[PDB]
Design a protein around this nucleic acid. Structure first.
Length: 227
RNA sequence: CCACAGAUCCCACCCGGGUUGAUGAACGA
RNA sequence: GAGUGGCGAUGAUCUGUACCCCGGCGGGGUGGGUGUCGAUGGAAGUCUGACCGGC
């Protein structure tokens, strides 16, 4: 075993007893895991193993995401927080300084998000519909990163709408494009092109476009900058 | 010896089972 | 001149030589099994489908 820093703040890799390499984050709440993930101690510091198959952000990293705009003390608005798998990892990355506002409109699921956000001062859960930022306007601030993973046909439009509400100028947006929930009939690759055009036809400046394959089928993630 | 009975067996329908479980399957608030 | 303090059944040794280490000893780690509990940890990991009867 060995753990060491990567190009990106508070994100680390492990050399393993066998010789595999897995991503991990520095555990903000030591002894405690959110999904079933492995806890690893090295030189008396505890890391949480970041499974790429579950977290699209880890997936994006392993698919060579240039620069990660989520770091120490970053303010992120996180649309589609779901059960808290990925958002827990951005909690770790961001540390007590930065803040993460987790928007999620499915109660059956915010149920389990609560448990994550109780243990974590970083995370401000919100049972609200991301199509109406008016209904959480009164709790959030402006932000550096708009991380958007929402299952919706008009997911791109929703994201833009939130952006002009809460995204700082020169802030970054990580937008997960879910082809099969925008249209199961269309070709995933046509969809990626047309949704990126929406961002450009607003004024987002496409920085990097990644295809999340192995890890996520018919998905892509866009990193771009709001102007 | 036949006749006729008997009940069984199916045998197939018939019904219910039954698409909201037939089966068999060794326990321990 | 008076009182105290003096081996020993009313009881020494042998083995948990742990490893080896740095300074017989100090400290160190690695060990054993054992007390606690835990983790989430690890366990063909989670039955079966042709026709069941009543008549």
């Amino acid at each position: 075993i060995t753990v060491k820093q990567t190009n990106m703040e508070n994100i680390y890799e492990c050399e393993f007893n066998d010789g595999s390499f897995r991503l991990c984050t520095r555990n903000l709440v030591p002894n405690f895991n959110v999904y079933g993930e492995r806890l690893i101690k090295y030189e008396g510091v505890e890391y949480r193993e970041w499974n790429a198959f579950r977290s699209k952000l880890a997936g994006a990293i392993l698919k060579g995401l240039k620069t990660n705009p989520i770091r120490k003390g970053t303010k992120v608005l996180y649309l589609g927080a779901a059960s808290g798998t990925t958002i827990s990892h951005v909690s770790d990355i961001i540390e007590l300084n930065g803040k993460a506002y987790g928007v999620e409109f499915s109660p059956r699921v915010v149920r389990e998000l609560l448990l994550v956000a109780q243990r974590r001062p970083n995370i401000f859960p919100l049972l609200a519909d991301a199509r109406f930022p008016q209904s959480y306007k009164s709790v959030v601030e402006n932000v550096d990163v708009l991380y958007v993973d929402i299952a919706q046909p008009d997911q791109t439009d929703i994201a833009i709408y939130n952006a002009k509400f809460f995204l700082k100028v020169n802030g970054d947006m990580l937008l997960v494009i879910k082809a099969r929930s925008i249209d199961v009939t269309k070709d995933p690759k046509e969809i990626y092109k047309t949704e990126v055009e929406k961002l450009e036809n607003s004024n987002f400046e496409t920085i990097q476009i990644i295809n999340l394959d192995p890890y996520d089928k018919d998905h892509a993630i866009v990193l771009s900058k709001y102007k």
